[PDB]
Design a protein around this ligand. Structure first.
Ligand SMILES: COc1ccc(OCc2ccc(COc3c(Cl)cccc3Cl)cc2)c(Cl)c1
Ligand SMILES: COc1ccc(OCc2ccc(COc3c(Cl)cccc3Cl)cc2)c(Cl)c1
Lengths: 107, 235, 272, 68, 262, 272, 235, 59, 68, 68
């Protein structure tokens, strides 16, 4: 299930992180578990954190990805945007993919 | 009657099927057609028309008419890029919303050559030579003219013919690429540099804009119709 | 829906012909191919544009409406026929100004007990009546209008494969207009402002009429609800005058906008 | 009243039937009087994009100077 | 050459020494209704030279701050000589056009204007009420209208403006302006040309329609690259619009129409 | 798929031709037949290899997934398309390195009340939507994505014969790769270790997309669960480069192993 | 409409049926094939390739590279077997996991001739004569060279040609045998003995290995596709 | 028997369909027609006959 | 016993099949002995309204005086 | 567009129909335009295993010495 807490200020200067937590119940555990981030955002159709095996930077040069990747975990991944100008909002999304039902998440 | 045997798939509704059905308004006198100008037979015809690229997506320029303007100046020669782009026509934010990108987002695969045309909107008194480049994936993305010049490139001399076209040839490992950002089907990098420098005389503007256009070549095709993420509906 | 041309091998050049240079001010697009600017090899092209034909682009059943009826006036519902109640098919159609095609309608009907432990009902039969603009609209789930002596009706038995019917090109013009830059009335000089006023971009007040849906069975005190999802597929398609696609969220039947006016994200000019 | 067209075989089976004969043809018969009831044949043609790509009055060659 | 031309229609001639060819929309030249496509049965009127001639609408001025301009056809020509008379005396009317936009500067000026001809150019309104723009506002005549840099919702409930609010980058209709190039167009880049010339055939889903209720074409002019000069923050160059109706034929003659105004 | 050769009678020999002796170092297999080493009779061979053709070997519907939906987010589920979720079909496909074929998918749908004495529901209709890599994935069992204006959907009515559809050869390469000795990225010198890292043996992060399944009926408080068993059959088959079959238990999507590493039993060298 | 009558079997789903069904992705532009080396048309082609037999399944050797090595020595002549095997290609532990055995486990019946090739991996200075034998079922399994020599056998003389092939002819009562251990369709015994003895000079290794290979002959066939027990899945 | 596949629309009742059905009174001796004056083939024939207009709808 | 008639194509697909061939024909076969079981062919003729519009004994020309 | 192939009769009935005529033939007609919709014909060919069994450069005879 999806339980993202990210409603974050968010401090400018900068810099701070843009987290994404998806706590996993619990007896029907999730794969494949690639993680996608879509901005909001003139999205046609990329400024993306995607992570298949090796973390792939869809071109927004000012990014930092910190998840225990190339292996697996799965995803309570944290992103970071520096920097350092007010490349603001708008908004951001955090969508996952799953073998069971979960090719889906929440903005 | 005639003995029949029902096979699996019976009574289902495939959203992409192609069967016949009874007409609810029989013997209806259909209004004949007229020859209306501008008829279209294939979606690829639209992908071959030049559409302006929103190259300047900086925070102050994005979502304004300024996102289409890339400014140049008469400064002394520099080897740093004027602009940088990734060849992901359906996913790169600068390409994803052009007519070409819009159509690609209704399909899962794309293949073919593309062409980028740049228009110089400086005064007639302004001159200059620019280097437009394309580097197939696999190496470090060019950051200086020295690296860019080693790949596919067109040296544009500014003058009477206001525009210059650079064709990005189909150089791929797979027979088709995906319309999503994926490293396996990555396309490469597009960049521009000053070859010499923009030169203007006195009483002439020292800064001017260039506009970029993108369209598909005659060997371009797409396949696997899918739904776009460019339109949504809440509630 | 055909083949693409082969790539011919191309060698070096040193000439006065410069296909790389052009002038987009003319309003034309430079028809270059790879061999115009680089040395190419001969490639025998086998890819085709079979799936991007105007027909294949629209050859899918898209949902245009979800009509709901509560078999406990809700015993029957009326849906004004349109393609603008949903966004997906609407956006695809709007890549063009005019269109001409036949339509295939498939109806997926679902129903269920509102109560987990109460009520029971025998299998339901539905009547989907088309009311052409002008015909009497039902006032009750069981008034005389449901006799359909002239209106086309479809009787669906719950559980049977989705119902499906075909409709010819029914426009009163030679093509359907996706955009109409005008009014149905011209206000004349002298008349009250209340007079001659009409909606911008609207043609007939009742273009295609509507659908009246009801459950034919006698309603039981049991709480039940049914939903008829209408799927439409344009077949035998012809389209005219391409237009750029909708970039911001729809705001009504018109081209009006209000909310998502900043569709593009930020990206560095020199960032790959 | 049957219409017999041929299919464009994609994946080929290790059979000669995958390369020839009625085995690579498909048959069609219309059952309804109204053309609206018909399915889509999907044997659709293409055209020249020129009306959109080059709606120019005085035709120009790519090798030749556009502005003359 | 591609650059020198002369257009003669009726008693009017236009010359240019800095053209960039001419565009014939969708490759179709205007024509009269053929018997096989005819609808109204009455004998049509074809004014010919009296209506099919060049009419010069009002000149607008381009400044560094301009967002763009728009006009609607046949609306912009409703008061033009005998063309306007025939338009108002007949229930039905049909016409094609030759649009000639004029804009000269100097070799030390910069700027590029995108001139687009749009069939069924529906524009966005200013209120939360859908399709609320009133007839009088939708049909400005020869003076046309202007594009804005942003959307501003009309909140006066007592006296709603019921007008358009065409945002420039949204092409005044909720689509991105950079894609407007799919419509017949030309670009007036000051370092290259003086004008833009577009020949527009009659486009509609009918052979003939009401010219008062319906506008077939829309002309949109947007500054693609803003006007700039030497060092004069202050610069103004006029943009004159000359349009000539073609193959005019009207049906359904009666008393004259006098539409409500302002 | 044909005949085998007849056995020709063979008598005694005393010659310098010795087919019994060979040298396997060359990399070749000695093509001997019985008559090469013993006296044979003439036998007219009537057995054929009709059932061991590449086509007949795969001409069976194998289960590749069991998608579950609880009609009381579980109101809908998403399954990433793959043949590696099960072991039987996977092992057969892996006798070869590359393959090219069409696919036939049959869906067996079952459902039941969780409670022996509680709840009731009317007949269910399911929607199986294919979401090609790139298309928007449903966030709710009833959001806009289920309009399927372009994605192919299959609406199944509970109790009807299993649904079935055919899919063409959809690979972006000229054949499907059962094994890919490589990466999707090449880490470049200088970049952070977090950079350019990808899974070994993986191509696209999303190869074939996924299936989104849901019950279209309005959910009732009743506790119900449904399972869609997906069966796939390769038809019009061509395969390349044979490989030895999997001997130890599978350990993931790769060739990784961990557990049953000692597959063979003990047996005396001189024990029959 | 046309009167029809539904026959039993209607609406069922036979896992082995062969019917047509609607295409979910119509008009898809299929990527054409390329001539990839090593294409296969029949599974029996794979059964005809020599595959090494894990002959030494003793507790210390099984599941190691030593299970493939059968050691010989220069000891004085003995009439005791070097190895013993049962002709149950799909069930005997030593044959069941070879390429041949793996394929046979996907079928219920097998018929045809087989051939066993042995490779001598001793030094060039080593010589010797061995007797490879095959005894059709029904009598006591050979335990001495004297009994083995009464059945089908090949006397292998070691020298330049390093290998020797013994063909096990199709000698059966039934037209097809089963791929399970069953006495009714039992196949017989394979054994090896020293004819003379392995002889080596001084300064030469006195013990060496031989490797065995098994493949099907051109008259081999299988039928009745079934599921193998060689792959399982827990949970 | 012959393998068939049921398509959507099956078992429905379109009020405007045009199919065949079994005859409930087989071999019935139908009374032949006679040439009755005033036969009509198209409804438009009736629309072409002059009909008096109720022009004065005052109270 | 099949009857093959042609349809009056309204909306045309971008195919040549929409303009010719068996693709614009429809096939019919009667399965019942009684004509009552048959569907309606709908290939129905028209006639002269004169019996209603001009049931006049002495035929008159519109250009000529009706009352003569 | 019907394809008529013959069956390989296994068990024979005490009829002459079990040995000849259309009674040992089967008929096929494709109903779909896409070849993917087609069933498998199963009239599949075989080939030479040599590419696997003898991928040797210099061809050798079994009677003749392999190592020469
Ligand atoms: C440009 O895009 C368009 C144009 C016209 C459209 O609708 C025209 C239309 C007219 C009549 C009917 C009536 O169809 C029906 C009948 Cl007879 C019987 C039963 C059910 C139906 Cl459903 C249905 C649609 C649509 Cl949805 C999109
Ligand atoms: C080497 O072995 C392979 C290769 C590819 C495979 O999958 C490719 C694949 C691609 C798209 C679809 C989509 O198919 C569907 C559609 Cl359109 C509609 C409805 C349901 C389905 Cl199910 C299904 C499978 C598999 Cl399972 C094995």
């Amino acid at each position: 299930v999806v339980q993202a807490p990210t409603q974050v200020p968010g401090f400018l200067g900068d810099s701070v992180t843009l987290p994404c937590y998806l706590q996993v119940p619990n007896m029907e555990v999730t794969h494949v578990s690639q993680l996608t981030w879509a901005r909001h955002g003139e999205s046609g159709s990329m400024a993306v954190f995607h992570q298949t095996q090796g973390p792939s930077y869809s071109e927004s040069k000012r990014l930092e990805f910190v998840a225990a990747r190339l292996g697996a975990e799965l995803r309570d991944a944290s992103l970071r945007m520096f920097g350092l100008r007010v490349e603001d909002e708008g908004s951001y999304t955090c969508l996952f993919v799953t073998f069971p039902q979960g090719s889906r998440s929440v903005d | 009657g005639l003995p029949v045997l029902n096979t699996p798939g019976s009574n289902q509704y495939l959203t992409a099927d192609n069967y016949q059905s009874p007409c609810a308004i029989p013997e209806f006198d259909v209004t004949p057609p007229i020859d209306i100008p501008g008829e279209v037979r294939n979606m690829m015809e639209l992908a071959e028309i030049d559409t302006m690229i929103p190259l300047n997506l900086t925070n102050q320029r994005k979502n304004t008419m300024d996102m289409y303007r890339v400014e140049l100046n008469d400064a002394a020669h520099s080897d740093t890029p004027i602009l940088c782009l990734s060849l992901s026509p359906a996913s790169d934010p600068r390409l994803a919303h052009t007519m070409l990108g819009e159509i690609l987002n209704y399909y899962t695969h794309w293949a073919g050559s593309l062409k980028f045309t740049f228009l110089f909107c400086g005064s007639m008194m302004a001159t200059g030579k620019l280097l437009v480049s394309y580097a197939p994936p696999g190496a470090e993305a060019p950051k200086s003219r020295k690296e860019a010049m080693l790949g596919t490139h067109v040296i544009w001399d500014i003058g009477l013919q206001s525009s210059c076209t650079m064709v990005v040839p189909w150089i791929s490992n797979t027979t088709y690429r995906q319309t999503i950002n994926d490293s396996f089907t990555e396309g490469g990098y597009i960049s521009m540099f000053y070859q010499t420098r923009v030169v203007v005389p006195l009483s002439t503007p020292r800064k001017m804009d260039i506009l970029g256009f993108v369209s598909a070549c005659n060997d371009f095709s797409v396949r696997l119709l899918r739904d776009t993420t460019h339109i949504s509906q809440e509630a | 829906a055909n083949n693409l041309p082969d790539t011919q091998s191309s060698g070096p050049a040193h000439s006065k012909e410069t296909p790389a240079l052009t002038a987009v001010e003319t309003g034309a697009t430079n028809p270059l191919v790879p061999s115009d600017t680089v040395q190419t090899r001969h490639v025998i092209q086998k890819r085709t544009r079979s799936e991007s034909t105007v027909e294949s682009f629209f050859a899918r059943g898209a949902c245009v409406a979800i009509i709901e009826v509560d078999n406990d006036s809700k015993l029957f519902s009326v849906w004004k026929i349109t393609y603008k109640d949903t966004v997906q098919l609407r956006r695809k159609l709007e890549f063009f100004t005019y269109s001409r095609f036949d339509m295939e309608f498939t109806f997926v009907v679902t129903s269920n007990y509102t109560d987990a432990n109460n009520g029971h009902a025998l299998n339901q039969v539905y009547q989907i009546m088309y009311i052409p603009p002008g015909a009497p609209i039902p006032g009750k789930w069981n008034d005389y209008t449901w006799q359909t002596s002239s209106n086309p009706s479809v009787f669906y038995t719950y559980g049977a494969p989705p119902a499906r019917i075909s409709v010819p090109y029914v426009g009163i013009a030679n093509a359907y207009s996706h955009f109409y830059d005008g009014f149905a009335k011209v206000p004349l000089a002298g008349q009250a402002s209340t007079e001659g006023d009409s909606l911008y971009g609207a043609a007939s007040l009742n273009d295609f009429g509507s659908l009246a849906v009801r459950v034919v069975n006698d309603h039981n005190p049991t709480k039940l609800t049914s939903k008829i999802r209408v799927y439409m597929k344009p077949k035998h398609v012809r389209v005219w005058c391409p237009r750029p696609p909708r970039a911001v969220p729809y705001y009504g039947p018109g081209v009006d906008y209000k909310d998502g006016l900043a569709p593009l994200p930020g990206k560095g000019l020199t960032t790959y | 009243g049957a219409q017999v067209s041929s299919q464009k075989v994609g994946a080929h089976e290790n059979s000669n039937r995958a390369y020839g004969g009625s085995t690579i043809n498909y048959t069609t018969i219309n059952y309804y009087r109204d053309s609206a009831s018909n399915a889509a044949s999907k044997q659709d043609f293409a055209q020249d994009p020129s009306k959109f790509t080059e709606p120019i009055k005085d035709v120009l060659i790519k090798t030749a100077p556009t502005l003359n | 050459s591609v650059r020198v031309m002369q257009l003669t229609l009726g008693n009017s001639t236009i010359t240019t020494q800095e053209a960039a060819n001419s565009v014939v929309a969708y490759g179709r030249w205007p024509e009269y209704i053929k018997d096989s496509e005819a609808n109204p049965v009455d004998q049509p009127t074809e004014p010919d030279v009296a209506a099919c001639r060049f009419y010069t609408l009002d000149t607008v001025t381009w400044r560094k701050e301009s967002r763009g301009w728009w006009w609607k056809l046949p609306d912009a020509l409703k008061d033009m000589g005998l063309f306007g008379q025939n338009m108002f005396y007949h229930y039905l009317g049909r016409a094609g056009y030759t649009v000639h936009v004029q804009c000269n500067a100097s070799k030390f000026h910069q700027g590029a204007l995108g001139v687009f001809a749009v069939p069924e150019m529906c524009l966005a309104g200013d209120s939360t009420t859908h399709m609320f723009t009133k007839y009088e506002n939708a049909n400005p005549g020869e003076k046309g209208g202007e594009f804005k840099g942003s959307f501003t919702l009309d909140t006066n409930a007592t006296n709603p403006a019921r007008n358009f609010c065409p945002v420039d980058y949204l092409f005044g209709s909720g689509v991105l302006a950079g894609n407007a190039f799919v419509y017949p167009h030309q670009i007036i880049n000051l370092r290259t040309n003086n004008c833009a010339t577009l020949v527009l055939p009659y486009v509609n889903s009918l052979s003939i329609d009401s010219m008062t209720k319906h506008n077939n074409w829309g002309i949109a002019i947007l500054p693609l690259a803003p006007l700039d000069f030497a060092t004069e923050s202050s610069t103004e160059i006029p943009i004159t619009l000359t349009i000539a109706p073609m193959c005019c034929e009207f049906n359904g003659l009666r008393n004259i129409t006098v539409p409500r105004t302002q």
